[PDB]
Amino acid sequence: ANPCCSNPCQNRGECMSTGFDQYKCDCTRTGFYGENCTTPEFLTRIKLLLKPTPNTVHYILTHFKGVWNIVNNIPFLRSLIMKYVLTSRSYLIDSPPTYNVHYGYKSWEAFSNLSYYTRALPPVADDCPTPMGVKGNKELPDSKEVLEKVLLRREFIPDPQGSNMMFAFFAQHFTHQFFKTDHKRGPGFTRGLGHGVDLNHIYGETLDRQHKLRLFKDGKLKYQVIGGEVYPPTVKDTQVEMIYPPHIPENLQFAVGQEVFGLVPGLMMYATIWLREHNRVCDILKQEHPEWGDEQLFQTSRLILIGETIKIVIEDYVQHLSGYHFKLKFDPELLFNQQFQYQNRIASEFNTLYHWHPLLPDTFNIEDQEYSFKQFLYNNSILLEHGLTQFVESFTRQIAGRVAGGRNVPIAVQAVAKASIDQSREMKYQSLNEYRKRFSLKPYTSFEELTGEKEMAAELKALYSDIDVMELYPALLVEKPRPDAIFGETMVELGAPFSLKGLMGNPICSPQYWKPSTFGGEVGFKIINTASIQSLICNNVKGCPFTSFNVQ
Amino acid sequence: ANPCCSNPCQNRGECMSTGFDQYKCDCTRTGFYGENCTTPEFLTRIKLLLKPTPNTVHYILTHFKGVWNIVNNIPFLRSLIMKYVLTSRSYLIDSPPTYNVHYGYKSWEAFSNLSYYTRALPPVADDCPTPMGVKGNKELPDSKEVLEKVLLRREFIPDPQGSNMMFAFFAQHFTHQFFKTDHKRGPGFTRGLGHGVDLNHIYGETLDRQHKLRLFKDGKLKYQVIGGEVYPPTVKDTQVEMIYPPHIPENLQFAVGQEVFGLVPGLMMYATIWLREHNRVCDILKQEHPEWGDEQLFQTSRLILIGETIKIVIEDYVQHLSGYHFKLKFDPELLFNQQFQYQNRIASEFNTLYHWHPLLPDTFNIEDQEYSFKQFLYNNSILLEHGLTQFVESFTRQIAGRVAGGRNVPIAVQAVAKASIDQSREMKYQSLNEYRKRFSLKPYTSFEELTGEKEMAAELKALYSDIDVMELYPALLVEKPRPDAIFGETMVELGAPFSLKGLMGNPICSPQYWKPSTFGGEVGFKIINTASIQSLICNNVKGCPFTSFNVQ
Ligand code: HEM
Ligand code: HEM
Ligand SMILES: *[C@@H]1O[C@H](CO)[C@@H](O[C@@H]2O[C@H](CO)[C@@H](O)[C@H](O)[C@H]2NC(C)=O)[C@H](O)[C@H]1NC(C)=O
Ligand SMILES: *[C@@H]1O[C@H](CO)[C@@H](O[C@@H]2O[C@H](CO)[C@@H](O)[C@H](O)[C@H]2NC(C)=O)[C@H](O)[C@H]1NC(C)=O
Ligand SMILES: CCCCCCCCO[C@@H]1O[C@H](CO)[C@@H](O)[C@H](O)[C@H]1O
Ligand SMILES: CCCCCCCCO[C@@H]1O[C@H](CO)[C@@H](O)[C@H](O)[C@H]1O
Ligand SMILES: CCCCCCCCO[C@@H]1O[C@H](CO)[C@@H](O)[C@H](O)[C@H]1O
Ligand SMILES: CCCCCCCCO[C@@H]1O[C@H](CO)[C@@H](O)[C@H](O)[C@H]1O
Ligand SMILES: COc1ccc2cc([C@H](C)C(=O)O)ccc2c1
Ligand SMILES: COc1ccc2cc([C@H](C)C(=O)O)ccc2c1
Ligand SMILES: *[C@@H]1O[C@H](CO)[C@@H](O)[C@H](O)[C@H]1NC(C)=O
Ligand SMILES: *[C@@H]1O[C@H](CO)[C@@H](O)[C@H](O)[C@H]1NC(C)=O
Ligand SMILES: *[C@@H]1O[C@H](CO)[C@@H](O)[C@H](O)[C@H]1NC(C)=O
Ligand SMILES: *[C@H]1O[C@H](CO)[C@@H](O)[C@H](O)[C@H]1NC(C)=O
Ligand SMILES: [Cl-]
Ligand SMILES: [Cl-]
């Protein structure tokens, strides 16, 4: 019965009830006016005429490779373009943040309480007649039916962009520092109170956990040596709580910053690589600063690793998944003459869209072994048996699955996929098309337009009836991909703003931090500015195997 | 020991050790270069040449009233000047924040741990040969001797700016939402995790406390009615913890957001006024929104009261203490085309400088009574006996003491003033002159220059020996005042940056919050934009007595 249930205000106008059955739209700074903020100002009309579509911009970025090779070697132009990428994306994110699962209006509680994920769109109010507001049936379709018909994998569909298992596990490892759902409280709550790239998945969320993981000599993290190789220490040694099933013996209960990283050896591979990297940087800093104590060595190494992470995420990881011929750049100085907020709050919708389970293969192929999900999960003995070198060589060669395009979620994780649907509903997510509008995208007018195809589209129409009631999460996984691409339009145009804002919003990118002295001088600073996924592997994995996020 | 102990890097350059007995200065973005960041770039030379001193700017702002009267009535020019006041002041504050009591270098711990006050200047390292670094004697002078010789009141010295007890108690009430030292941890730690104007001193720091203070009908806060007058509810009724001696009568144990506010009736006066204001705003919003529930009424009223507070602080409180003929303005829109960070971390030095105990009179004069400190402390019966109307009338008439100029701290609070000195030392504060340099002020070259007189200067020279080892806090209280002013140069040039940044950094000032719908529509927004100390009192105090921050 909330008069704002229909989501009447357009173009980011805010709806407020003015009585039991009346509403008012606040069109402040939208560029539009009128009852529903749909009448454009003159300069807004000009902007809408000139603005190219995401599909047009994507086409330009993924063609003309010869022209981009030239542009990439003109620093002024590369800087200009990267600057526009950062600013245009970041403008789509509210900062300071606004809504959350419990607040569809701005409040001090929603602003101040860091235990909530924020919300890019407010929840559908509890008293609205339908799940999506006023459109659709009284109940959304059975999530098991949605899952089985259009999400579950029949035959494995490989990623045409050539993403590999190094990419899949990097995505999981990296994102799991800021997607840490507090299941005790609910799906709209997080345990990652840093709300970004703080490397708590290496160092621990709390000071007591950090201190249990630290050696307190030379800035270093605790470790063990097994057959001459460095691995994280044990739960027994450190008293650091981890999630393991009872059958895992004490010697295989590795303790790392993030309590869930014993789940799969792919996570423990990266946990081990980053642990080694921290201790490597400690050695470098000690060489430069014989006068420094353990605490400053530890803290400075952490800041360097934060920098390395952001560098690799932009110039290797995002570079790869983007598919662009343009060479992306990690350069905080690009924002120093721009309006930009050095802060971030993690959005629930960002968490939801990043459930990239179709990346996962049917089996995990290491050396000449093909491990099932059941064999792979909670099995660090696989890591010890093969070693990091073989893990990297094998993961670099193994292709990942396509995320968009439908029917590619492995059956082994069907319950996780269903949970993503169900939890979106619990959190009262607005529809796909509302989210499309929120990120300046044209609403889909049919299910065939969404999928680019007839079969799944017809299945969805029978389930949902109205395209305006289609849900965000399943839509991301069935969406028509870009040509030979891993993702469709909605994934990129939502994903990119959340991602780049989260990376550049870090305080190390602010002008008072982005200085050599922050990182122990020019040598420390250069570790950040020259970091890559290859360098990380080369320095910390025996033999310096070749690696990349693309299969060969 | 540490080669950075002498504070060699100038002009906000950062010092890093490069060995046991060698340092480097990082002059990045300072405008200077060379070993100590003292060689200016050409543009810096020009800016230095043209830039007027604070004393010259203060002169211009406090003279030429006829010209300012014209300026104040030309909106474009008033906006231009206020914009420059906000941006030039805020530029002096590091945001995101950097140092704290435990970290003299940037670290993730210092950035992320909200339990610390931040630091405008890093602490003097523990292994430095002297308290201030390398200058001065091995120990600072006896703090009791400094207190007695130059701080303690002989005869009451009234404020020549005419500040009254409404002003004094407003300062105390307002600032104690963000100065809440966690004495269990130490003077460098805070319990005010909002780090700004969140009105926790009305609503409680934690959700548990807030919920005990709330009525859960119509958005309102609980209250009691004594002699037909509204007062805060009791500790017994609410179960909220307050600090009171055990003998205080049950009905006089008033429970409010801030646990210390039973300390003096002056604080409880403002607590009662704001409580009434919250409930008054609830009534207004209920009339506008009969469809709204208790939670939205409560939250929206809180946001409105935050706005009212910022409005009153700038346009009444700061306006008064500034002494300027220019009419200051609370207008978030002034910053929308500027680079500005909507965040704040409370600085330890801001806490220290705001210990304005000389404001306090020898006795508290209400109606025909003159209460001693002993009679006034923890004595809410005084408030009940006289009533709010009489409190306002009396405190509007009673003059407060001068803060600068020396020898005006009442002996009744001598232990608090001594603690301010001792805790500054414990927190390893750098010297007055280092702080002056940090805020673009010229170092004092003698004690006579500091005080503008001979007697106190001579006592200080005998105690401290070197002007470069004079301490910040006692210096603020002995500094030569501006002509017929309450403060000297150092108080204004340090206080203003911290103050204005804390006010404008609030999320309600950000573009996504600063719109009518945030506050329940134009009716709510108007409450903020028309707020004043006179209207606060008129709306909530029987008989609408005249009030002001200056004696008439
Ligand atoms: C390696 C095999 C994997 C397994 C066995 C697995 C399993 C799971 C499970 C059981 C959950 C909890 C779901 C719930 O709350 O009910 C989860 C959450 C999640 N997964 Fe995976 N997953 C895997 C790989 C990946 C990959 C490659 C990604 C790509 C980024 C990913 C992204 C996520 C995200 C973002 C969450 C939400 C985390 C949170 O909110 O705490 N997962 N996964
Ligand atoms: C009215 C009588 C007042 C009394 C009896 C009083 C007493 C005290 C006491 C006992 C403390 C705690 C000291 C400590 O534990 O280290 C304190 C702190 C403080 N006082 Fe006052 N004071 C009064 C008025 C004022 C006024 C008018 C101001 C003006 C702003 C003020 C500013 C402060 C500040 C900023 C603190 C530090 C708060 C914190 O960090 O927790 N006080 N005062
Ligand atoms: C942030 O919000 C959550 C949700 O309201 C708070 O968690 C609740 O706190 C209340 C009051 O203490 C408890 O009674 C509930 O059991 C908590 N859990 C819920 C409702 O999920 C949390 O306290 C808030 N955090 C802060 C810092 O205030
Ligand atoms: C913020 O920093 C303080 C100071 O280091 C932390 O408090 C300490 O916590 C450690 C580890 O639990 C204890 O050994 C000390 O007793 C505490 N010291 C003091 C002075 O209180 C605090 O835990 C940090 N807060 C957060 C959120 O990490
Ligand atoms: C020639 C390529 C220039 C690089 C800029 C493109 C980076 C992504 O630019 C995006 O394009 C979309 C459609 O115009 C907009 O909706 C987004 O706000 C914008 O960030
Ligand atoms: C005529 C003055 C109108 C402009 C208002 C200026 C408000 C105070 O401006 C201050 O002046 C100081 C001395 O120049 C500077 O050091 C500070 O950075 C600046 O904020
Ligand atoms: C356009 C008008 C410019 C006139 C500016 C008057 C400058 C007054 O400058 C003087 O500077 C001294 C600095 O120590 C202070 O002690 C004096 O109080 C102050 O009057
Ligand atoms: C309220 C005063 C309590 C402390 C006073 C004793 C400390 C001695 O301090 C002295 O006080 C004299 C009298 O004011 C001054 O003439 C001297 O300059 C000063 O050194
Ligand atoms: C989380 O998912 C994504 C998907 C696509 C992205 C594309 C881009 C490029 C650089 C872009 O078009 O902005 C960035 C981040 C992205 C994150
Ligand atoms: C906390 O103590 C102060 C003292 C002086 C101030 C002056 C000003 C004016 C407007 C200024 O010169 O900026 C603002 C705030 C101030 C706070
Ligand atoms: C505003 O939207 C409503 C429904 O959302 C529609 O009926 C109405 O016509 C719109 N008003 C205008 C003036 O366009
Ligand atoms: C764990 O992996 C090993 C190989 O390292 C494999 O032989 C074993 O079967 C796995 N454990 C389980 C429970 O499947
Ligand atoms: C408290 O105030 C009352 C007047 O309201 C006064 O008579 C009494 O002396 C005071 N109590 C104490 C303990 O000083
Ligand atoms: C700073 O370096 C200068 C060189 O210009 C040197 O003369 C001076 O001694 C240094 N600083 C100090 C602490 O004197
Ligand atoms: Cl990302
Ligand atoms: Cl202030």
mmCIF file with all atom_site columns, N, CA, C and O in Angstrom, chain A residues 412-443:
data_model
loop_
_atom_site.group_PDB
_atom_site.id
_atom_site.type_symbol
_atom_site.label_atom_id
_atom_site.label_alt_id
_atom_site.label_comp_id
_atom_site.label_asym_id
_atom_site.label_entity_id
_atom_site.label_seq_id
_atom_site.pdbx_PDB_ins_code
_atom_site.Cartn_x
_atom_site.Cartn_y
_atom_site.Cartn_z
_atom_site.occupancy
_atom_site.B_iso_or_equiv
_atom_site.pdbx_formal_charge
_atom_site.auth_seq_id
_atom_site.auth_comp_id
_atom_site.auth_asym_id
_atom_site.auth_atom_id
_atom_site.pdbx_PDB_model_num
ATOM 1   N N  . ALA A 1 412 ? 27.114 -29.556 -9.291  1.00 0.00 ? 412 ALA A N  1
ATOM 2   C CA . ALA A 1 412 ? 27.740 -29.651 -7.964  1.00 0.00 ? 412 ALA A CA 1
ATOM 3   C C  . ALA A 1 412 ? 27.447 -28.455 -7.039  1.00 0.00 ? 412 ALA A C  1
ATOM 4   O O  . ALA A 1 412 ? 27.380 -28.620 -5.817  1.00 0.00 ? 412 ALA A O  1
ATOM 5   N N  . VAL A 1 413 ? 27.268 -27.262 -7.608  1.00 0.00 ? 413 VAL A N  1
ATOM 6   C CA . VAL A 1 413 ? 26.954 -26.068 -6.809  1.00 0.00 ? 413 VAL A CA 1
ATOM 7   C C  . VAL A 1 413 ? 25.538 -25.533 -7.048  1.00 0.00 ? 413 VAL A C  1
ATOM 8   O O  . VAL A 1 413 ? 25.288 -24.333 -6.886  1.00 0.00 ? 413 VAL A O  1
ATOM 9   N N  . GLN A 1 414 ? 24.607 -26.419 -7.397  1.00 0.00 ? 414 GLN A N  1
ATOM 10  C CA . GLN A 1 414 ? 23.237 -25.989 -7.697  1.00 0.00 ? 414 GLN A CA 1
ATOM 11  C C  . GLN A 1 414 ? 22.558 -25.302 -6.500  1.00 0.00 ? 414 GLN A C  1
ATOM 12  O O  . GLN A 1 414 ? 21.816 -24.331 -6.679  1.00 0.00 ? 414 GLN A O  1
ATOM 13  N N  . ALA A 1 415 ? 22.836 -25.788 -5.291  1.00 0.00 ? 415 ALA A N  1
ATOM 14  C CA . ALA A 1 415 ? 22.252 -25.215 -4.076  1.00 0.00 ? 415 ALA A CA 1
ATOM 15  C C  . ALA A 1 415 ? 22.741 -23.792 -3.809  1.00 0.00 ? 415 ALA A C  1
ATOM 16  O O  . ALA A 1 415 ? 21.992 -22.969 -3.279  1.00 0.00 ? 415 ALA A O  1
ATOM 17  N N  . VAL A 1 416 ? 23.989 -23.506 -4.175  1.00 0.00 ? 416 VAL A N  1
ATOM 18  C CA . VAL A 1 416 ? 24.554 -22.164 -4.021  1.00 0.00 ? 416 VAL A CA 1
ATOM 19  C C  . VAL A 1 416 ? 23.889 -21.199 -5.003  1.00 0.00 ? 416 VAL A C  1
ATOM 20  O O  . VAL A 1 416 ? 23.551 -20.067 -4.648  1.00 0.00 ? 416 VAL A O  1
ATOM 21  N N  . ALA A 1 417 ? 23.704 -21.652 -6.239  1.00 0.00 ? 417 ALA A N  1
ATOM 22  C CA . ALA A 1 417 ? 23.012 -20.854 -7.250  1.00 0.00 ? 417 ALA A CA 1
ATOM 23  C C  . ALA A 1 417 ? 21.574 -20.555 -6.827  1.00 0.00 ? 417 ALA A C  1
ATOM 24  O O  . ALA A 1 417 ? 21.116 -19.421 -6.960  1.00 0.00 ? 417 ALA A O  1
ATOM 25  N N  . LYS A 1 418 ? 20.876 -21.564 -6.306  1.00 0.00 ? 418 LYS A N  1
ATOM 26  C CA . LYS A 1 418 ? 19.497 -21.385 -5.832  1.00 0.00 ? 418 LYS A CA 1
ATOM 27  C C  . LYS A 1 418 ? 19.451 -20.387 -4.676  1.00 0.00 ? 418 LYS A C  1
ATOM 28  O O  . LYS A 1 418 ? 18.540 -19.558 -4.595  1.00 0.00 ? 418 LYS A O  1
ATOM 29  N N  . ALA A 1 419 ? 20.434 -20.481 -3.787  1.00 0.00 ? 419 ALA A N  1
ATOM 30  C CA . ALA A 1 419 ? 20.541 -19.570 -2.648  1.00 0.00 ? 419 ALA A CA 1
ATOM 31  C C  . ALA A 1 419 ? 20.701 -18.115 -3.086  1.00 0.00 ? 419 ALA A C  1
ATOM 32  O O  . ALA A 1 419 ? 20.150 -17.221 -2.449  1.00 0.00 ? 419 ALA A O  1
ATOM 33  N N  . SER A 1 420 ? 21.437 -17.882 -4.171  1.00 0.00 ? 420 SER A N  1
ATOM 34  C CA . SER A 1 420 ? 21.600 -16.533 -4.717  1.00 0.00 ? 420 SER A CA 1
ATOM 35  C C  . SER A 1 420 ? 20.258 -15.953 -5.148  1.00 0.00 ? 420 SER A C  1
ATOM 36  O O  . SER A 1 420 ? 19.975 -14.778 -4.899  1.00 0.00 ? 420 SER A O  1
ATOM 37  N N  . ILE A 1 421 ? 19.429 -16.783 -5.777  1.00 0.00 ? 421 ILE A N  1
ATOM 38  C CA . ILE A 1 421 ? 18.094 -16.359 -6.191  1.00 0.00 ? 421 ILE A CA 1
ATOM 39  C C  . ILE A 1 421 ? 17.249 -16.085 -4.956  1.00 0.00 ? 421 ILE A C  1
ATOM 40  O O  . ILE A 1 421 ? 16.668 -15.004 -4.820  1.00 0.00 ? 421 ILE A O  1
ATOM 41  N N  . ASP A 1 422 ? 17.194 -17.063 -4.055  1.00 0.00 ? 422 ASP A N  1
ATOM 42  C CA . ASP A 1 422 ? 16.321 -16.992 -2.881  1.00 0.00 ? 422 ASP A CA 1
ATOM 43  C C  . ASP A 1 422 ? 16.680 -15.822 -1.972  1.00 0.00 ? 422 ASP A C  1
ATOM 44  O O  . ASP A 1 422 ? 15.792 -15.147 -1.453  1.00 0.00 ? 422 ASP A O  1
ATOM 45  N N  . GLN A 1 423 ? 17.975 -15.587 -1.793  1.00 0.00 ? 423 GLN A N  1
ATOM 46  C CA . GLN A 1 423 ? 18.448 -14.513 -0.912  1.00 0.00 ? 423 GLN A CA 1
ATOM 47  C C  . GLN A 1 423 ? 18.207 -13.123 -1.500  1.00 0.00 ? 423 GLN A C  1
ATOM 48  O O  . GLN A 1 423 ? 17.877 -12.198 -0.762  1.00 0.00 ? 423 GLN A O  1
ATOM 49  N N  . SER A 1 424 ? 18.340 -12.978 -2.820  1.00 0.00 ? 424 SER A N  1
ATOM 50  C CA . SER A 1 424 ? 17.917 -11.751 -3.502  1.00 0.00 ? 424 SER A CA 1
ATOM 51  C C  . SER A 1 424 ? 16.459 -11.420 -3.190  1.00 0.00 ? 424 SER A C  1
ATOM 52  O O  . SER A 1 424 ? 16.114 -10.261 -2.967  1.00 0.00 ? 424 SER A O  1
ATOM 53  N N  . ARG A 1 425 ? 15.608 -12.443 -3.185  1.00 0.00 ? 425 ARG A N  1
ATOM 54  C CA . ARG A 1 425 ? 14.185 -12.264 -2.898  1.00 0.00 ? 425 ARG A CA 1
ATOM 55  C C  . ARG A 1 425 ? 13.958 -11.896 -1.438  1.00 0.00 ? 425 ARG A C  1
ATOM 56  O O  . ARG A 1 425 ? 13.165 -11.005 -1.139  1.00 0.00 ? 425 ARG A O  1
ATOM 57  N N  . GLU A 1 426 ? 14.666 -12.580 -0.540  1.00 0.00 ? 426 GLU A N  1
ATOM 58  C CA . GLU A 1 426 ? 14.613 -12.284 0.893   1.00 0.00 ? 426 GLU A CA 1
ATOM 59  C C  . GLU A 1 426 ? 14.969 -10.818 1.144   1.00 0.00 ? 426 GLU A C  1
ATOM 60  O O  . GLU A 1 426 ? 14.338 -10.146 1.962   1.00 0.00 ? 426 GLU A O  1
ATOM 61  N N  . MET A 1 427 ? 15.967 -10.331 0.412   1.00 0.00 ? 427 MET A N  1
ATOM 62  C CA . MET A 1 427 ? 16.441 -8.954  0.537   1.00 0.00 ? 427 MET A CA 1
ATOM 63  C C  . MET A 1 427 ? 15.615 -7.953  -0.276  1.00 0.00 ? 427 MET A C  1
ATOM 64  O O  . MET A 1 427 ? 15.963 -6.772  -0.351  1.00 0.00 ? 427 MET A O  1
ATOM 65  N N  . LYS A 1 428 ? 14.517 -8.425  -0.864  1.00 0.00 ? 428 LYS A N  1
ATOM 66  C CA . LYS A 1 428 ? 13.552 -7.576  -1.562  1.00 0.00 ? 428 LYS A CA 1
ATOM 67  C C  . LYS A 1 428 ? 14.189 -6.733  -2.667  1.00 0.00 ? 428 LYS A C  1
ATOM 68  O O  . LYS A 1 428 ? 13.951 -5.522  -2.765  1.00 0.00 ? 428 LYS A O  1
ATOM 69  N N  . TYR A 1 429 ? 14.996 -7.393  -3.495  1.00 0.00 ? 429 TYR A N  1
ATOM 70  C CA . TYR A 1 429 ? 15.589 -6.775  -4.672  1.00 0.00 ? 429 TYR A CA 1
ATOM 71  C C  . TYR A 1 429 ? 14.516 -6.351  -5.663  1.00 0.00 ? 429 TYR A C  1
ATOM 72  O O  . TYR A 1 429 ? 13.574 -7.096  -5.934  1.00 0.00 ? 429 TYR A O  1
ATOM 73  N N  . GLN A 1 430 ? 14.686 -5.156  -6.216  1.00 0.00 ? 430 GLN A N  1
ATOM 74  C CA . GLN A 1 430 ? 13.922 -4.725  -7.376  1.00 0.00 ? 430 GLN A CA 1
ATOM 75  C C  . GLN A 1 430 ? 14.317 -5.552  -8.602  1.00 0.00 ? 430 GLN A C  1
ATOM 76  O O  . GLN A 1 430 ? 15.256 -6.353  -8.554  1.00 0.00 ? 430 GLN A O  1
ATOM 77  N N  . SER A 1 431 ? 13.590 -5.354  -9.693  1.00 0.00 ? 431 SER A N  1
ATOM 78  C CA . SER A 1 431 ? 13.718 -6.178  -10.891 1.00 0.00 ? 431 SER A CA 1
ATOM 79  C C  . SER A 1 431 ? 14.965 -5.856  -11.706 1.00 0.00 ? 431 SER A C  1
ATOM 80  O O  . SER A 1 431 ? 15.583 -4.798  -11.542 1.00 0.00 ? 431 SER A O  1
ATOM 81  N N  . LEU A 1 432 ? 15.310 -6.775  -12.605 1.00 0.00 ? 432 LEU A N  1
ATOM 82  C CA . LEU A 1 432 ? 16.349 -6.546  -13.608 1.00 0.00 ? 432 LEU A CA 1
ATOM 83  C C  . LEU A 1 432 ? 16.204 -5.187  -14.278 1.00 0.00 ? 432 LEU A C  1
ATOM 84  O O  . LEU A 1 432 ? 17.165 -4.429  -14.344 1.00 0.00 ? 432 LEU A O  1
ATOM 85  N N  . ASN A 1 433 ? 15.012 -4.890  -14.794 1.00 0.00 ? 433 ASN A N  1
ATOM 86  C CA . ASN A 1 433 ? 14.820 -3.653  -15.555 1.00 0.00 ? 433 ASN A CA 1
ATOM 87  C C  . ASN A 1 433 ? 14.935 -2.380  -14.698 1.00 0.00 ? 433 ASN A C  1
ATOM 88  O O  . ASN A 1 433 ? 15.414 -1.354  -15.183 1.00 0.00 ? 433 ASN A O  1
ATOM 89  N N  . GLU A 1 434 ? 14.540 -2.450  -13.428 1.00 0.00 ? 434 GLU A N  1
ATOM 90  C CA . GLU A 1 434 ? 14.794 -1.339  -12.510 1.00 0.00 ? 434 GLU A CA 1
ATOM 91  C C  . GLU A 1 434 ? 16.301 -1.118  -12.327 1.00 0.00 ? 434 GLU A C  1
ATOM 92  O O  . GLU A 1 434 ? 16.764 0.020   -12.343 1.00 0.00 ? 434 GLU A O  1
ATOM 93  N N  . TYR A 1 435 ? 17.058 -2.204  -12.172 1.00 0.00 ? 435 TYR A N  1
ATOM 94  C CA . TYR A 1 435 ? 18.519 -2.109  -12.062 1.00 0.00 ? 435 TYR A CA 1
ATOM 95  C C  . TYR A 1 435 ? 19.171 -1.628  -13.356 1.00 0.00 ? 435 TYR A C  1
ATOM 96  O O  . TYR A 1 435 ? 20.128 -0.852  -13.316 1.00 0.00 ? 435 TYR A O  1
ATOM 97  N N  . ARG A 1 436 ? 18.643 -2.062  -14.496 1.00 0.00 ? 436 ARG A N  1
ATOM 98  C CA . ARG A 1 436 ? 19.120 -1.548  -15.779 1.00 0.00 ? 436 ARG A CA 1
ATOM 99  C C  . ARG A 1 436 ? 18.962 -0.023  -15.845 1.00 0.00 ? 436 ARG A C  1
ATOM 100 O O  . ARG A 1 436 ? 19.921 0.681   -16.131 1.00 0.00 ? 436 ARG A O  1
ATOM 101 N N  . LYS A 1 437 ? 17.773 0.482   -15.525 1.00 0.00 ? 437 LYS A N  1
ATOM 102 C CA . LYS A 1 437 ? 17.536 1.932   -15.519 1.00 0.00 ? 437 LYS A CA 1
ATOM 103 C C  . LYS A 1 437 ? 18.476 2.654   -14.549 1.00 0.00 ? 437 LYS A C  1
ATOM 104 O O  . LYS A 1 437 ? 19.011 3.716   -14.867 1.00 0.00 ? 437 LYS A O  1
ATOM 105 N N  . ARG A 1 438 ? 18.692 2.059   -13.380 1.00 0.00 ? 438 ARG A N  1
ATOM 106 C CA . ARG A 1 438 ? 19.576 2.637   -12.361 1.00 0.00 ? 438 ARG A CA 1
ATOM 107 C C  . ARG A 1 438 ? 20.996 2.884   -12.892 1.00 0.00 ? 438 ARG A C  1
ATOM 108 O O  . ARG A 1 438 ? 21.658 3.841   -12.477 1.00 0.00 ? 438 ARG A O  1
ATOM 109 N N  . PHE A 1 439 ? 21.454 2.036   -13.812 1.00 0.00 ? 439 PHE A N  1
ATOM 110 C CA . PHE A 1 439 ? 22.784 2.167   -14.406 1.00 0.00 ? 439 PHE A CA 1
ATOM 111 C C  . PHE A 1 439 ? 22.746 2.639   -15.866 1.00 0.00 ? 439 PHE A C  1
ATOM 112 O O  . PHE A 1 439 ? 23.652 2.343   -16.652 1.00 0.00 ? 439 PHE A O  1
ATOM 113 N N  . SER A 1 440 ? 21.697 3.396   -16.193 1.00 0.00 ? 440 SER A N  1
ATOM 114 C CA . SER A 1 440 ? 21.550 4.112   -17.470 1.00 0.00 ? 440 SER A CA 1
ATOM 115 C C  . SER A 1 440 ? 21.379 3.194   -18.674 1.00 0.00 ? 440 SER A C  1
ATOM 116 O O  . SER A 1 440 ? 21.738 3.558   -19.796 1.00 0.00 ? 440 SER A O  1
ATOM 117 N N  . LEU A 1 441 ? 20.795 2.021   -18.440 1.00 0.00 ? 441 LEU A N  1
ATOM 118 C CA . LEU A 1 441 ? 20.567 1.048   -19.495 1.00 0.00 ? 441 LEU A CA 1
ATOM 119 C C  . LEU A 1 441 ? 19.098 1.063   -19.896 1.00 0.00 ? 441 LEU A C  1
ATOM 120 O O  . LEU A 1 441 ? 18.224 1.375   -19.084 1.00 0.00 ? 441 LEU A O  1
ATOM 121 N N  . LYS A 1 442 ? 18.835 0.747   -21.159 1.00 0.00 ? 442 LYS A N  1
ATOM 122 C CA . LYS A 1 442 ? 17.466 0.651   -21.659 1.00 0.00 ? 442 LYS A CA 1
ATOM 123 C C  . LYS A 1 442 ? 16.828 -0.633  -21.132 1.00 0.00 ? 442 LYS A C  1
ATOM 124 O O  . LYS A 1 442 ? 17.438 -1.698  -21.218 1.00 0.00 ? 442 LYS A O  1
ATOM 125 N N  . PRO A 1 443 ? 15.609 -0.542  -20.570 1.00 0.00 ? 443 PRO A N  1
ATOM 126 C CA . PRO A 1 443 ? 14.913 -1.763  -20.163 1.00 0.00 ? 443 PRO A CA 1
ATOM 127 C C  . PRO A 1 443 ? 14.729 -2.735  -21.327 1.00 0.00 ? 443 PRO A C  1
ATOM 128 O O  . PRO A 1 443 ? 14.444 -2.311  -22.453 1.00 0.00 ? 443 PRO A O  1
#
